[PDB]
Design an enzyme around this catalytic site. Sequence first.
Site, mmCIF file in Angstrom:
data_model
loop_
_atom_site.group_PDB
_atom_site.id
_atom_site.type_symbol
_atom_site.label_atom_id
_atom_site.label_comp_id
_atom_site.label_asym_id
_atom_site.label_seq_id
_atom_site.Cartn_x
_atom_site.Cartn_y
_atom_site.Cartn_z
ATOM 1 C CG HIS A 88 -48.908 0.249 0.627
ATOM 2 N ND1 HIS A 88 -48.604 0.702 1.899
ATOM 3 C CD2 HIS A 88 -47.806 -0.398 0.183
ATOM 4 C CE1 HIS A 88 -47.379 0.325 2.215
ATOM 5 N NE2 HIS A 88 -46.868 -0.337 1.188
ATOM 6 C CB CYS A 137 -53.847 2.573 5.664
ATOM 7 S SG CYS A 137 -52.294 2.338 6.587
ATOM 8 N NE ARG A 168 -58.109 -4.682 10.602
ATOM 9 C CZ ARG A 168 -58.158 -5.913 10.100
ATOM 10 N NH1 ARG A 168 -58.447 -6.102 8.824
ATOM 11 N NH2 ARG A 168 -57.922 -6.954 10.886
#
Length: 202
Positions: A88, A137, A168
């Site tokens: 995460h 993320c 990303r």
Amino acid sequence: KILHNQNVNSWGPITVTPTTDGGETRFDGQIIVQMENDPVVAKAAANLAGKHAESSVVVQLDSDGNYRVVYGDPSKLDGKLRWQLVGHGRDHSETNNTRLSGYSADELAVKLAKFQQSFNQAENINNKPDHISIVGCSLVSDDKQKGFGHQFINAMDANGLRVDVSVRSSELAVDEAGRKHTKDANGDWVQKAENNKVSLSW
Ligand SMILES: *[C@@H](C(=O)N(CC(C)C)NC(=O)[C@H](CC(C)C)NC(=O)[C@H](CC(C)C)NC(=O)OCc1ccccc1)[C@H](O)C(=O)OCC
Ligand SMILES: O=P(O)(O)O[C@H]1[C@H](OP(=O)(O)O)[C@@H](OP(=O)(O)O)[C@H](OP(=O)(O)O)[C@@H](OP(=O)(O)O)[C@H]1OP(=O)(O)O
Ligand code: NA
């Protein structure tokens, strides 16, 4: 999202369901590195491995730099290797998230370097990764110029691992087939959004 990156011996195990639609992969072997003991991260790691099961090794790595193999055969790792780091991304900033699985770019680099040493010492496989894919993320700025990814690629170098890094800048999501999805401006999930990703190279 409870952060749990300590004591790998206490993490839940995983179950992989191989797929057939995987396709070609420019990597002879890969290691899916599960960075935290979170149900979502565990399944995404398992799903990625499932895309190329025969040549994928899943490892669980904690904050002590300790690991355990939870899938695959690390003896067969050879040739061009990829590492897909799963965790995460958290702690937003002007350059997007600043921590993966509770680690900053520099700390992650250290644990990974400690990992590499152990792995090579245990499985006698001194093959450094050729590419690193950060599966968390938005760990690079929107402009792709700054952020976690940039600090990371540099810290990795400073730690004896010169590698290319893909990362990303937006929200990230792994489906049951091991494929990545990014979130665009409208907020809808899409695939192959090249605007949502950057590849950092030397
Ligand atoms: C986002 C983050 O770090 N992260 C980890 C992934 C390993 C990349 N994302 C996810 O946790 C994501 C939901 C977030 C709210 C964005 N869930 C998944 O990726 C999940 C993994 C399964 C294998 C369990 N898949 C998922 O729900 O699939 C979506 C999907 C399915 C089918 C087609 C298309 C898309 C980080 O937490 C963050 O910054 O966001 C918090 C708001
Ligand atoms: O062959 P595809 O179905 O297009 O799969 C690609 C490919 O992954 P595979 O090795 O599983 O084929 C890319 O790997 P590279 O050779 O480009 O490194 C990967 O890119 P990353 O390595 O940067 O993850 C990309 O993932 P992304 O969606 O982030 O582009 C992913 O596409 P899928 O997401 O559809 O699997
Ligand atoms: Na492919």
